[PDB]
């Protein structure tokens, strides 16, 4: 099969254009600029963010998990994308941490 | 718990700087430019790609799945990032499809 009914964890994708602050590749909190100019034309800084809808879609944790043997929950993974960030007075072009998916994490039961 | 042993699907993150062709936001195959200049300073176009290590990490499908009730496999999700492209003529700063995570998809058993 290819087309599934649902994933183990439910995702929520939102196009974000109102970004003001973000955590950089290292961990430093950087100021995000709303616009980016590509020599001749200007573009509004848009970011595709996908996060977890709920940490426990099922009482046991993730959907379709062997509950009697596994401790599970839904966590949000990250991606690193270049963004026009303002550092004090000068504009920089460096990677920033962004929510990109909702995955399930396992742990053995006692 | 927070820190898990392993996810339901195994991921593999690779920093890609050798991108020549990519699928755009609609589906059109576009030519990706190797460098991007900020009017004076130049930057090599780097993309953070995360894909599936294997579709079936476990014989049944994904790890820690209720095999007797669910049909499962690991699929690669996508993200959309702005990249300096060229549709044969000139510069185009438009969104492109990129591998970003490895998730598990479920299906009910007969």
């Amino acid at each position, epitope marked *: 099969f*290819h*087309r*599934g*009914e*649902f*994933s183990v964890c*439910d*995702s*929520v*994708s*939102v*196009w974000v*254009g109102d970004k003001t602050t973000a955590t950089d590749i290292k961990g430093k909190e950087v100021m995000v600029l709303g616009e980016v100019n590509i020599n001749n034309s200007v573009f509004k800084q848009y970011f595709f963010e*996908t996060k977890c*809808r*709920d940490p426990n*879609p*099922v009482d046991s944790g993730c*959907r379709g998990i062997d509950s009697k043997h596994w401790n599970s929950y839904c966590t949000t993974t990250h991606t690193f994308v270049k963004a026009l960030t303002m550092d004090g007075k000068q504009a920089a072009w460096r990677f920033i941490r962004i929510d990109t998916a909702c995955v399930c994490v396992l742990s053995r039961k006692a | 718990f927070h820190r898990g042993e392993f996810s339901v699907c195994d991921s593999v993150s690779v920093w890609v700087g050798d991108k020549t062709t990519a699928t755009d*936001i*609609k589906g059109k195959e576009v030519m990706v430019l190797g460098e991007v200049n900020i009017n004076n300073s130049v930057f090599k176009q780097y993309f953070f790609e995360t894909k599936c290590r294997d579709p079936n990490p476990v014989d049944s499908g994904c790890r820690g799945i209720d095999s007797k009730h669910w049909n499962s496999y690991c*699929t*690669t*999700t*996508h993200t959309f990032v702005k990249a300096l492209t060229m549709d044969g003529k000139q510069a185009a700063w438009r969104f492109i499809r990129i591998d970003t995570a490895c*998730v598990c*998809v479920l299906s*009910r058993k007969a």
Partner: antibody
Amino acid sequence: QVQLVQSGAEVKKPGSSVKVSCKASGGTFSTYGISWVRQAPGQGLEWMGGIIPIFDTGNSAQSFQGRVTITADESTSTAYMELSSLRSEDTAVYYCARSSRIYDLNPSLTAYYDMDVWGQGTMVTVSS
Amino acid sequence: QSVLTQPPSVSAAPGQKVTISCSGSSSNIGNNYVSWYQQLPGTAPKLLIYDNNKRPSGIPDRFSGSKSGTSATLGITGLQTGDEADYYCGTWDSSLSAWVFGGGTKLTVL
């Protein structure tokens, strides 16, 4: 601020096809996932389908037997709903809605969205 | 006939807590998220609750939402004349691959 402006109310004959418009007044039309829900006078809500203009990926209800043809144009910022072969039972108030949240966006899953902001509505009457 | 089972009419006195029930199966509520809609006479529906409990901006703290298995409930505290409207159910059905709505509940205030 962002409001969904629909087409004017129409009265059509059985067997015809009505095309209802849904323009997003303001901006960021491609961001949302335009939905379509109909409501017969003094009856419940019936989901028809939807489309994401940025991906041009659509979804329709199986109950309609492929009569609904949901289309979208980013340039004009308008989403259209065409219901071919009109029946007396199709006499309803046709609403269009938007959602900034797109659930289950996966190549192996059918992507869906809620109905956050609703349109004013378009009354379609089928005279018999 | 509607997929989601809702009571036809509900009556309550002003300034009192009132509940509206919702019924379904594993195909919808059991493996998804419930959303509530407020439809005033001669007005378009309005999003009241989303993701079982969450409420959007503008909606007061007076409106509550809770989900338990294949059933969901809406809670309206501190009742008023303005609340007199038709309340609908809404969730995604994985098997039908369509958004399913409830019958509708007529809220009447003296």
